[PDB]
Amino acid sequence: DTGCAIDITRKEMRCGSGIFVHNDVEAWVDRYKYLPETPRSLAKIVHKAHKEGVCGVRSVTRLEHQMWEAVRDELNVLLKENAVDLSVVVNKPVGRYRSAPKRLSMTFVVDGPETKECPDEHRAWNSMQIEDFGFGITSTRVWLKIREESTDECDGAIIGTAVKGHVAVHSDLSYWIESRYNDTWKLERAVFGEVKSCTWPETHTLWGDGVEESELIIPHTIAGPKSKHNRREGYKTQNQGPWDENGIVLDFDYCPGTKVTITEDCGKRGPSVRTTTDSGKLITDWCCRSCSLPPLRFRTENGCWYGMEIRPV
Amino acid sequence: DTGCAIDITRKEMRCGSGIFVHNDVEAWVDRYKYLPETPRSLAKIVHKAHKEGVCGVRSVTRLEHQMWEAVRDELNVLLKENAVDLSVVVNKPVGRYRSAPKRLSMTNSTFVVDGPETKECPDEHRAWNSMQIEDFGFGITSTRVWLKIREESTDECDGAIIGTAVKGHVAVHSDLSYWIESRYNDTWKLERAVFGEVKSCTWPETHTLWGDGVEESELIIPHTIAGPKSKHNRREGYKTQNQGPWDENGIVLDFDYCPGTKVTITEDCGKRGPSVRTTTDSGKLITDWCCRSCSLPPLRFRTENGCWYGMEIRPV
Amino acid sequence: DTGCAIDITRKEMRCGSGIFVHNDVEAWVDRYKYLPETPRSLAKIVHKAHKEGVCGVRSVTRLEHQMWEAVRDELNVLLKENAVDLSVVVNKPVGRYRSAPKRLSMTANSTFVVDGPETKECPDEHRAWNSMQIEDFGFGITSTRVWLKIREESTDECDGAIIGTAVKGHVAVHSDLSYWIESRYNDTWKLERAVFGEVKSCTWPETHTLWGDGVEESELIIPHTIAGPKSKHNRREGYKTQNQGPWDENGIVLDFDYCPGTKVTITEDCGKRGPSVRTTTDSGKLITDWCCRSCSLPPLRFRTENGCWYGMEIRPVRHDETTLVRSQVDA
Amino acid sequence: DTGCAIDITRKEMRCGSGIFVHNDVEAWVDRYKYLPETPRSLAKIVHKAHKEGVCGVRSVTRLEHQMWEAVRDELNVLLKENAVDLSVVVNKPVGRYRSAPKRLSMTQEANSTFVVDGPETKECPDEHRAWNSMQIEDFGFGITSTRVWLKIREESTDECDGAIIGTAVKGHVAVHSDLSYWIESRYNDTWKLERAVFGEVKSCTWPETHTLWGDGVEESELIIPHTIAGPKSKHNRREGYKTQNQGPWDENGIVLDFDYCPGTKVTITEDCGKRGPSVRTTTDSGKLITDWCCRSCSLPPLRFRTENGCWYGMEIRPVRHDETTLVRSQVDA
Secondary structure (H helix, E strand, O other): OEEEEEEOOEEOOOEEEEEEOOOOOOOOOOEEOOOOHHHHHHHHHHHHHHHOOOOOOEOHHHHHHHHHHHHHHHHHHHHHOOOOOOOOOOOOOOOOOOOOEEOOOOOOEEOOOOOOOOHHHOOOOOEEEEEEEEEOOEEEEEEEEEEEOOOOOOOOOOOEEEEOOOEEEOOOOOOEEEEEEOOEEEEEEEEEEEOOOOOOOOOHOEEEOOOOOOOOOOOOHHOOOOOOOOOOOOOOOOOOOOOOOOOOOEEEEOOOOOOOOOOOOOHHHHHOOOOOOOOOOOOOEEEEEOOOOOOEEEEEOOOOOOOOOOOOO | OEEEEOOOOOOOEEEEEEEEOOOOOOOOOOEEEEEOOEEEEEEEEHHHHHHOOOOOOOOOOOHHHHHHHHHHHHHHHHHHOOOOEEEEEOOOOOOOOOOOOOOOOOEEEEOOOOOOOOOOOOOOOOEOOEEEEEEEEOOOOOOOEEEOOOOOOEEOOOOOOOEEEHHHHHHHEEOOOOOOEEEEEOOOEEEEEEEOOOOOOOOOOOHHHHHOOHHHHHHOOOOOOOOOOOOEEEEEEOOOOOOOOOOOOEEEEEOOOOOOOOOOOOOOOOOOOOOOOOOOOOOOOOOEEEEOOOOOEEEEOOOOOOOOOOOOEEEE | OEEEEEEEEEEOEEOOEEEEEOOOOOOOOOEEEEEOOOOOHHHHHHHHHHHHOOEEEOOOOOOHHHHHHHHHHHHHHHHOOOOOOOOOOOOOOOOOOOOOOOOOOOOOOOOEEEOOOOOOOOHHHHEEOEEEEEEEEEOOOOOOOEEEEOOOOOOOEOOOOOOOOEOOOEEEEEEOOOOOEEEOOOOOOEEEEEEEOOOOOOOOHHHHOEEEOOOOOOOOOOOHHHHOOOOOOOOOOOOOOOOOOOOOOOEEEEEEEOOOOOOOEOOOOOOOOOEEEOOOOOOEEEEOEEEEEEOOOOOOEEEEEOOOOOOOOOOEEEOOOOOEEEEOOOO | OOOEEEOOOOEEEEEEEEEEEOOOOOOOOOOOEEEEEOOHHHHHHHHHHHHHHHEEEOOHHHHHHHHHHHHHHOOOOOOOOOOOOOOOEEEOOOOOOOOOOOOOOOOOOOEEEEOOOOOOOOOOHHHHHEEOOEEEEEEOOOOOOOOEEEOOOOOOOOOOOOOOOOOEOOOOOOOOEOOOOOOOOOOEOOOOEEEEEOOOOOOOOOOOOOOOOOEEEEOOOOOOOOOHOOOOOOOOOOOOOOOOOOOOOOOOOOEEEOOOOOOOOOOOOOOOOOOOOOOEEEOOOOOEOOOOEOEEEEEEEEEEEEOOOEOOOEEEOOOOOOOOOOEEEEOOO
16 A cells, blocks of 8 residues: 655655555565465365366466465365375476366366376366465465356456556566567566466556557467567567476577677578577577567576577578 | 555565555645756747747646746746847636647747637647656755657657556556546446546556557546546446536545435436536535436545536436 | 665665664654653652652753653643642753753642753752653654653663664764764774764663773763763764863754864964864954864864854964853863 | 665654665575686786795685685686696685685785695695685676675784674664674663574674674673674673583584474573583484483573584583483584
């Protein structure tokens, strides 16, 4: 409600009332811990899912995966009094979290190995909603409850977007997309701590009228806001980027120790191309047909990458 | 920008970096003050406009009117030392800051600013929105805002001071004069819109949440009164209020019950028309108000003059 | 605590957890507001005090005087309701807040005077001083409320709940709600500036003092008896205790520079150390010639409301001693 | 330092100007990065020192060791390019950063090695090593890590570097801290030591210009010894406890607290023995000792919590036990 902050662009330091949006992604610890409802109800929910034929639930966010990992032991202890022998296992993640076309319930093989015993076409996905927040000295308790109406978009109670001066932000507990204004509205840098496949809500997107989904940058399948602050000039949707990796950072610069040279005629499109091949020497000469400088680069954990329109001559 | 804040719905108080959109329209003290870049250039532009046939300029914001009032003496001294027959006068803003068709075009005289429609200068060739906010300056009480001139004629509000945000079941479209708030209670709807000025610029679409597939006839605040072209700007059973108390001072829009007035939802109470004041010629207050199809609570206007009601509501 | 900050000397804009010491002396609007535990209890306090041996009280801080002035009416109404022949009158302070022996102990002819000059009715020997202590804080929209309670000891030190002392990489501060003493390091630690919102008489606690080993009572720039820290940061090379400065004016600022339109030259045949002398005489004529026996440059300057003063070592060169104003604090 | 803050005790959020003492020891990323003045002249410094009779250098803080590690390659390259028969080698730390009697001089303009932070090798003994010959000069700018330039000292000292030390007190809480230490004290009817956090154990001497309440102090009652850079203050003491010479000062990740180590019990009976070196709760077989004897403690007792889990102070001794399969500190500071 009330905030008290420093403004460098206005060269002032005021302390008043309004709405303050904070960068919760680039932090070394987690402040919010997902908490489910009473496990006594989840027991019968899991029983109904097992009876119907649900072989697992695919987590939408890393925090739900952490919640399942934390509650597996408690659920196992509380169960088996009336149910039958069943395996609820929380495996480790392999990459981006996919979307399953089956809802969980209404008013187990979790994401991990893609073992054929549990078909993905009969897996649960995105059936929990945030009810209210809880106090806590060590961490902020975020309660949960089952969703009533089946949708295909992200949780709205955690989305925060703002534009104060010439800076714009589309962000939540996982993503953080920035925009700037020097002569035209363009994307500056995006920071993905994970990759989920929900959809940014239509009511938390700014400047989203008359927009074509082909001229975006972050595809709307990877939960990229369908707005005009989400796009860059000269670049199309980056569907074939390094989205399978982890710790993806999107910005516009040069990969370390590299040069980019525009060419009249070279490779036009294709999949994302690796920077260093280890066996061969680090690539130093690159070509493009219609690009802009500095080019975009994905700085994931393994090194550096380039876009879908930059290929080595 | 680094700062600290207190969250009530999140039950936490935290410091960090991000975006801080602050409410500075309901504070009873001034905080900003506009200054021209070069006062000497103002005299040259005024002389150029006078030669080109520009009688005067309409202030877009009351801060622009205050800026003209401040620079009145400086421009008077400049014209006195330049030996030309001219004078500049500053009146009191009568109603609302309307628009003008012309600009400060580039390529005893009376330099009136606002007021009624003079015989010598009609309200048909005046200037409006010819200055742009360039940068800020340090100030202990009033932060200096330095102005320049634009290159192209734009009919939308200046977007260097406009702040919008949505962080959890709550949304804001605000600037130095407007503050519009919307909430989530089983659906998204408008809560409150505190005025303090009535401009006529257009709210930029680059500062507009939920801007896809918006119908112009369902906006509570018309898009000609700098009403955002969003879908938070509406409620169930209401349409564009092009006829309202948009000429008063310090108007507040909210949904509640004014003193008196009963809940009559009959479907035969005439046709929608202009707003009707809740006072019988400085006398009794009407307690019989009816709507053909509306929602509860009704739409009021917390003007300091009194209470009004929406266009759809007409007294029996 | 928790908070973000800008660091000029580190070229940073940080944010995190630690200790932040603010500057609440050079401010226009008062930030705090002293309040007693309850006006009903202070009525019993004052009744018992006047019953035993106390004819009046003497504030230690300006905020304590303001609290007494604010609660005078409520205390008087309560004691009139209790059918007691007493009255509480608050006069206005003249100079620095001097100390008094007696203390207040917890449980219209006669009067209970407050801050003011010495009168035959209530001699200075029968007054209270520094007899209550900060208990807690309260949330306030415009001004936070600081609650007070009767102090059951008889200390002569300043209240530690508000003292803020900090040193961070070649800059040091001793401060509280009415003092702000600034020291800086340039090849040597020395005093640089000190702004007073008042002149108290309590003793700075040693638990809030930096560099307090082997200090000489005769070297501290501001005396230890007017709430000057017993530190070596409160020190300058070439000067001694300024026990006879202009410690009676208001809005006083101590720093090292030249008073306007004057100069000083070092010479050994100058006079001796005495009370400080104003730059301008009573008539209003400047004295533009000054000498010191052993003084460092720039000089020691008092920036008060009446005018501009020098330190007790700087003396006028010739002039006379019949038209010059000299301080008489005997601090 | 203009900034804002949130004060729990005052119940106030405000902005202003003052001094911000910020915890930099409990950080998950390094915010400061030491750099040498000029790598070209550092080679001349090393050559002159080697000729004068210095066979190696011993780092004072972990950041100095990190700087030496990061600049070793460039130093070797420059020395080899200038045709110099000298090599700088950086070893890994073993315990607390000990002291040395020699110093590096100021800048003037079969195989020989320049060992850094090595153990007691007979080639380069302890008495032929440098120590504390550098000084912070200025700060730089960096989005990730700020730059802290260094310069050779002119006059020999045994004191820690005062350009980073931050000491503060406000009300009923005090802090002695720098980039490596975080000492905390609190007031509850008495000022007493409350919690100390270490990143390493150096052996410089805390300057008196940055200490609080350092009047008439006794060196035999300081909880943290003054020979491992413990401030010579009276916020540095707690009642009933004397200096902890033979503590677990050779371990890493130390946190000094006053609490009960899990699963153990302490009694204040007078039939105990005498204070000696620290004794870890767990034996060789990992069996918790659940009977401890102290003479004149003040519960809760000291609790050194290193990566080994638990240690106790000098005054705490085990009950009805013997010197067998139990681990004691071999340090004597």
